[PDB]
Design a binder for these strands. Structure first.
Ligand SMILES: [Mg+2]
Ligand SMILES: [Mg+2]
Ligand SMILES: [Mg+2]
Ligand SMILES: [Mg+2]
Ligand SMILES: [Mg+2]
Ligand SMILES: [Mg+2]
Ligand SMILES: [Mg+2]
Ligand SMILES: [Mg+2]
Ligand SMILES: [Mg+2]
Ligand SMILES: [Mg+2]
Ligand SMILES: [Mg+2]
Ligand SMILES: [Mg+2]
Ligand SMILES: [Mg+2]
Ligand SMILES: [Mg+2]
Ligand SMILES: [Mg+2]
Ligand SMILES: [Mg+2]
Ligand SMILES: [Mg+2]
Ligand SMILES: [Mg+2]
Ligand SMILES: [Mg+2]
Ligand SMILES: [Mg+2]
Ligand SMILES: [Mg+2]
Ligand SMILES: [Mg+2]
Ligand SMILES: [Mg+2]
Ligand SMILES: [Mg+2]
Ligand SMILES: [Mg+2]
Ligand SMILES: [Mg+2]
Ligand SMILES: [Mg+2]
Ligand SMILES: [Mg+2]
Ligand SMILES: [Mg+2]
Ligand SMILES: [Mg+2]
Ligand SMILES: [Mg+2]
Ligand SMILES: [Mg+2]
Ligand SMILES: [Mg+2]
Ligand SMILES: [Mg+2]
Ligand SMILES: [Mg+2]
Lengths: 206, 152, 100
RNA sequence: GGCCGCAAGGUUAAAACUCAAAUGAAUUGACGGGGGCCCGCACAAGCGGUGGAGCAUGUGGUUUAAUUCGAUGCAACGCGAAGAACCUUACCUGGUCUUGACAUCCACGGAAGUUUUCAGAGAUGAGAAUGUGCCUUCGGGAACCGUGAGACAGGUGCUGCAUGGCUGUCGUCAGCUCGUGUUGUGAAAUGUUGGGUUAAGUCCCGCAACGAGCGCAACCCUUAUCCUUUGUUGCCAGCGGUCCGGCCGGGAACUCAAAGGAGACUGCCAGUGAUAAACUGGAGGAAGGUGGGGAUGACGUCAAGUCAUCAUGGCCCUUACGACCAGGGCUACACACGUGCUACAAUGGCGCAUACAAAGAGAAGCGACCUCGCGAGAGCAAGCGGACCUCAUAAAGUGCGUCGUAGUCCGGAUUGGAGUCUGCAACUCGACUCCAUGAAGUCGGAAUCGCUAGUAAUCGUGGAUCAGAAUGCCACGGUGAAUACGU
């Protein structure tokens, strides 16, 4: 059968939203449209910066964007010569003045998005999927994670028939609401087609 | 059911007679959840019958009730393609239920002008063994009489 | 959808908001009860002159991302599929699964 | 062929030709018109329907220039589509374009826009005035318009049997595995079997097994009882005035609103039980053994559905399988099926008068009051971004009168005349109003569906989509049953 989104079912319990502004009906569609464009752009340039999440907030007639990254030095640039240009382009796109903050991600091997992106890159570079999946599981578990599950599906190895394979260690109780689960996905465009990757990481009870 | 967990549900007494049995009769006669119409109809019929008899509503209803209620029925039991018609007794609550249901269904099929008149005429007839309800009871009794060879 | 449909929608919006005021004034003239039927006839003949795409009724709601013309929701500006996709990632503020 | 026999036949006993296997024992599943033990509106016990009539709507077939495409046993058929006059539109006929309706690169004339006229169904072609700037090292960079080439753009074209993502179903069924140890030459087994018990691989005891994971249960939302804080636009018990209007002065008791707590745990009593798990009953309490309802869908099955939400390998077209416009079609019609609505009446039809809800929406919007019209509506026009204003008198119910069993004072299909509103535009092909007309239908063959309580049945109200267009879909309250011996 099908499973519920691990993020969606815990938004009122343990997980917070990625957008934290208020608006009436007349502003709502425009706000989502601008947020979509901003996130797409920052994803476009900052690909080699290992950015996990982009939080967008709208205090009053302005905007504040906080990006979480594992390589803050390359994002910042030289004494801030890049944050200002990114700020100016975001201000151009959104139509309001902007301010940008950088948050460092300690232990980047415990973030599901980063692991998914790493696995995708390795698959693109022609690496055997079992090798990469086992490395991901070992790296996550050595840093104190309570559990990790990694699933890869698609036309594996260039075969004529697609299939799905997954590995798991620890506890991953998806039916427990209060539990802290980070779940995220990625796609790889190999010479034979697309390969999908999903990662679940279980951290703590409350 | 397979579990045998149910109990029994409480029933309220009738408005102006203080009787549960009349309330059950009203419920049997009700359609679509319109209880007020059914209770007015039954009250009118009972009043007319009491006037045309003189005893009361209560024991007149009771007297009609002993004349329609059954005492033994049949149940089917498949064996090898055909069916045994085994006779079994009826509990008193089921006796009352069957009597009231037969009475109401017989009264619904008549050609008078109002349902109150239909019910009053039918129940007055049944008070002394002339209606279709007593005929149905006699047929049930006869059919249960024939197949007593399988009554263990 | 096709890029042609998106171009057509953009052009229709442009023509509509370019001719809004003139359409308003001609329609106001026609809708009046105290006037001259000759003026009403002239106004009717003039209203047909404008390009058909200037009518607001010629525009179809579509998803801001994919262009799907079915399943729109006015509150968000997206069809059902994209609403669910975005809402499951916490990108729509205050929205969550309901149960009552 | 020989030998034997009355015969039926016995006995000794080949070859050509043809295939890549045929066969024994044991292992894991699946199946049995095999055997035990359980469950489920599965039967039984009851209530109301469908299959017959008229109409709405989807499908098959036939027809057509076109009737665009997909879903098509359970698990397709009021399905994608939460709303086809033009647009949507993907289809047909005709008229037009070729670096192009939509992006980047180079060269050149360049404001952006505002009214205009002729020809044309429009696409488009030609023409007439006007602002021609804005930071600017006066070199201009350039929001953005036209021309010239190619590198390219474009494809709702094919393959869901090349794929990602998403969904249906078995099934909210109680199952599905792993590490180490042991047993077997081995596929494998044990654990996960046995006695009780539960809704449950739920729990207790024994055991060559010892432990662990995903499932079950708990954490989440709402409803039922009480407590504390705050009282406006919400409330009015005790006081003063009244135009009888909580209307005013006032009060924080009460309904109510929304934040935070208590509460239900087999907690206590009795009996059985293997002193265990547990089971039957009782007290208190708003609620008793999972109190009610929702969310939550294990490992997998069906090469199940979706290349037309999107993304994508490979194939295919490039003055056309890409692009623009007008008109038409998707709404046809000897017929067959699915899902619905309205009826066939007296537990009713009609007339007059009068009680009692919940939930929700509102700025290119909801729209009161007053006037006109029999009516749909029209004119003027307060209030509201809302516990304040509008939508917006709830209906079934109740009291009085009539009709008195008739194809009717039941039923409201079809048809003629006159209009209203939205919209450039109601012929094909919209909804609604008034007058006239008054069809089949008297409870439905063989068959067949739903439901265990605030449920079935019946009566009204709101929302999304939306210029206009619900008998469909998603929500909310009023009245309120029958039956369950049993497997
Ligand atoms: Mg496209
Ligand atoms: Mg439209
Ligand atoms: Mg011989
Ligand atoms: Mg012989
Ligand atoms: Mg064999
Ligand atoms: Mg064998
Ligand atoms: Mg068996
Ligand atoms: Mg069996
Ligand atoms: Mg039955
Ligand atoms: Mg029919
Ligand atoms: Mg079709
Ligand atoms: Mg097909
Ligand atoms: Mg349906
Ligand atoms: Mg059309
Ligand atoms: Mg698939
Ligand atoms: Mg060994
Ligand atoms: Mg098992
Ligand atoms: Mg086993
Ligand atoms: Mg065993
Ligand atoms: Mg056992
Ligand atoms: Mg367990
Ligand atoms: Mg659960
Ligand atoms: Mg008690
Ligand atoms: Mg008790
Ligand atoms: Mg297939
Ligand atoms: Mg498939
Ligand atoms: Mg198919
Ligand atoms: Mg296709
Ligand atoms: Mg057209
Ligand atoms: Mg159609
Ligand atoms: Mg009538
Ligand atoms: Mg009749
Ligand atoms: Mg009429
Ligand atoms: Mg049940
Ligand atoms: Mg209801």
């Amino acid at each position: 059968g099908q499973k519920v989104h691990p993020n969606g079912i815990r938004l009122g319990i343990v997980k917070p939203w990625n957008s934290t502004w208020f608006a009436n009906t007349k502003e709502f569609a425009d706000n989502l449209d601008s947020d979509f464009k901003v996130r797409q752009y920052l994803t476009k340039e900052l690909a080699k910066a290992s950015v996990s999440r982009i939080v967008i907030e709208r205090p009053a007639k302005s905007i504040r964007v906080t990006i979480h990254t594992a390589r803050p030095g390359i994002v910042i640039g030289k004494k801030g010569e890049d944050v200002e240009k990114l700020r100016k382009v975001v201000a151009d796109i959104a139509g309001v003045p902007a301010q940008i903050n950088i948050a460092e991600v300690r232990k980047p091997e415990l973030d599901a998005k980063l692991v998914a992106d790493s696995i995708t890159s390795q698959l693109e570079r022609r690496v055997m999927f079992r090798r990469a999946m086992k490395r991901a599981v070992q790296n996550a578990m050595r840093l104190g994670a309570k559990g990790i599950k990694v699933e890869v599906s698609g036309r594996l190895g260039g075969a004529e028939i697609a299939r799905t394979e997954w590995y798991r260690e620890g506890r991953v109780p998806l039916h427990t609401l209060r539990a802290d689960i980070d779940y995220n996905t990625s796609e790889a465009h190999t010479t034979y087609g697309v390969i999908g990757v999903k990662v679940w990481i279980f951290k703590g009870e409350i | 059911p397979r579990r045998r967990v149910i109990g029994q549900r409480k029933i309220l007494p009738d408005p102006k007679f203080g009787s549960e049995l009349l309330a059950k009769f009203v419920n049997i006669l009700m359609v679509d959840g319109k209880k007020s119409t059914a209770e007015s109809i039954v009250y009118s019929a009972l009043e007319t019958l009491a006037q045309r008899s003189g005893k009361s509503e209560l024991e007149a209803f009771e007297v009609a009730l002993e004349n329609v209620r059954p005492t033994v029925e049949v149940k089917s039991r498949r064996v090898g393609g055909s069916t045994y018609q085994v006779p079994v007794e009826v509990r008193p609550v089921r006796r009352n239920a069957l009597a009231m249901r037969w009475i109401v269904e017989a009264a619904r099929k008549r050609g008078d002008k109002s349902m109150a008149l239909r019910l009053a005429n039918e129940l007055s007839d049944a008070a002394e063994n002339k209606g279709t309800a007593v005929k149905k009871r006699e047929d049930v009794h006869r059919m249960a009489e024939a197949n007593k060879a399988f009554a263990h | 959808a096709k890029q042609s449909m998106k171009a057509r929608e953009v052009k229709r919006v442009a023509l509509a908001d370019k001719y809004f005021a003139k359409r308003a004034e001609l329609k106001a003239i026609i809708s009046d009860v105290n006037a001259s039927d000759e003026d009403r006839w002239n106004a009717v003949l003039k209203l047909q002159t404008l390009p058909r795409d200037s009518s607001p009724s010629r525009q179809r709601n579509r998803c801001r991302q994919t262009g799907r013309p079915h399943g729109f929701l006015r509150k968000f500006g997206l069809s059902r599929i994209k609403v669910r996709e975005a809402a499951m990632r916490g990108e729509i503020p205050g929205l969550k699964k309901a149960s009552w």
